[PDB]
Each structure stands twice: as structure tokens, then as C-alpha cells.
Amino acid sequence: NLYFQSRNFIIPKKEIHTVPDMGKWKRSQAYADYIGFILTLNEGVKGKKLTFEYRVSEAIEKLVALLNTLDRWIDETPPVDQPSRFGNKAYRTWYAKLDEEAENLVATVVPTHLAAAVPEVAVYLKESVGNSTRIDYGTGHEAAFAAFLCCLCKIGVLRVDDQIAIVFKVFNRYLEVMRKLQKTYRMEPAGLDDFQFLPFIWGSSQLIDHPYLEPRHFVDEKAVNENHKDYMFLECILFITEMKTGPFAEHSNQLWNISAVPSWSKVNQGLIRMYKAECLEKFPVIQHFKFGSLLPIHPVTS
């Protein structure tokens, strides 16, 4: 992609200020590029297990290392006894470290000739792990992580051969770290799932045309337990059953209803529509999205 020193980068800022601003978002270059990216990754993983032998580049290993740094800091930042009954205030300590170190982290991944991109790209990383004031996490934070990855593709740090690894290695790791934050700091949800959305899209794509596992099986704990290592969708269900009390039909009714859909292809197609409507076109969710040079607010070009 960008082989020569590049300097025209912009610190991303909010542009969806009120509900009327949703039109400029839907027409934006950023939206087109973002949904394009999600769908490109969705096609790439179709029919493949997490154990598929995919290419792992240096950039991918550096991204995993960046996530491991975040994980280490959780370990270094234990929960505290506190008066409040919701999220644990140690999250704020952990978040402060990420906020101060985000550019340094991103610089481990971005080559020298793209140094000027780091401040722009790091804003997406900073925005992808929850809210320090509320100690909550939602699908807007997840979207910020996907936007971070998208930026790295846009500047050529990640390439087309990396697309399986982006989902199966990097995003997969990110979800592990997010689950650890959610559980360790008792984060509140900021609906399909309390916290996530994308892994259900990419995960259902893995299972398209599966010869044995059908959507009805994801609400069978034994099928989940026996197959979760191969399938991101099933790993998400396992986390829910660990986190929630009582019958699945009652605590996760949307997913329960989805388990009745006849095929994973139809699950995938439906989840894409649902994501666009309930995340990307939902002001309270997507108002968080920031726009710079790489994911810009200007109308999409032809």
C-alpha cells in the first residue's frame, strides 16, 4: 500500500453529534470502508475452522503482542474492594495506562515511514476497550477495534494475505482480553449479546455449509463444549453460559430465537442486517465513532 514516507494524517474526532447527523454517517466514506472491511473478512473466513492453517505475518505477531501487553496490565492491576456495586474502579487504573501508552503500543506495529499515522490509528485503539467513567463496554467499542484494524489495512501494514489471521488470531485474541476485562472488572453492558456482535457474524460465516453443526446446536451446551475451539460463534456462547444464570432462552432470548434459523448462511445474512440496523444505524451506539483521514466523514467517492 503506502511504501513511501506519508504525513497527511488527522486525529479522529466525533462527527455524529445528534440524530440528524446519522445521514452524513450513512453516506460517508468511513461507513462504506468499514462495512466493506467487515464483509471482506466475513468472506475470508467462510467455512474455515480456527485450526485452519493460515498465514501469520510479523504484523499479526506484533498485534498479538500488543494485546498481550494489555492482558499483562490487567494482571498487574487487580480489582479493589470498593463501595460501588457495579464496575470495579481498578478498570480506570488499567484504562489510564492504555490511554497514556496507546501511541507507543501502536508504534510497535507501524513501520517508521508511516510514523505520522500512529496518533490517528491509536485513537481507535484507545476507544476500543470500554468507557472509563461508566466502566462499561458495548458494540461501539468493538467497532472501534475493527476500525483500528481497518486503518492498519488502509496503510498497508495488514494485507490481503493477513485477512484470515486478522479474525482468527488478532480479533480472537482481542475477544479473550475483552472477556477478561469484563469478568475481572465486572463491567456493565453499555439485544444480541451483552458486549459483542462481530464474532457472531464472522463465527456464523465459519459454519456456513457445515455438514453436522446447525444453528440449533449452539444452544446445546455439549455441542458448544465439544466444538468451541474450532468456532468463534460457539466460544461466544460458552462465555455467555459462564456469565449468566438460568436457562439460555430467558437470559439470551434473541440468540435463542436465532438458533431456530434453518442454516448458518441465513444466520450470517440476518446478523449482517441486524448489525447494520442495531449497531451501525443506532445513534446511541455509533455516536462514539471518530473520523479522521483514514475513515473520513466526507461523502463516499465513486
Curated annotation (Swiss-Prot):
Disease named in the record: Parkinson disease 25, autosomal recessive early-onset, with impaired intellectual development: An autosomal recessive, early-onset form of Parkinson disease, a complex neurodegenerative disorder characterized by bradykinesia, resting tremor, muscular rigidity and postural instability, as well as by a clinically significant response to treatment with levodopa. The pathology involves the loss of dopaminergic neurons in the substantia nigra and the presence of Lewy bodies (intraneuronal accumulations of aggregated proteins), in surviving neurons in various areas of the brain.
GO biological process, one term: mitotic spindle organization
EC number: 5.2.1.8
Listed InterPro entries: Phstyr_phstse_ac, PTPA_C_lid, PTPA_sf
Tissue: Widely expressed.
Gene: PTPA
Annotated residues for binding of Mg(2+): D194
Keywords: Acetylation, ATP-binding, Cytoplasm, Disease variant, Intellectual disability, Isomerase, Magnesium, Metal-binding, Neurodegeneration, Nucleotide-binding, Nucleus, Parkinson disease, Parkinsonism, Rotamase
Family the entry assigns: Belongs to the PTPA-type PPIase family.
Name the UniProt record assigns to this protein: Serine/threonine-protein phosphatase 2A activator
Effect in UniProt of substituting M274D: Abolishes interaction with the PP2A(D) complex
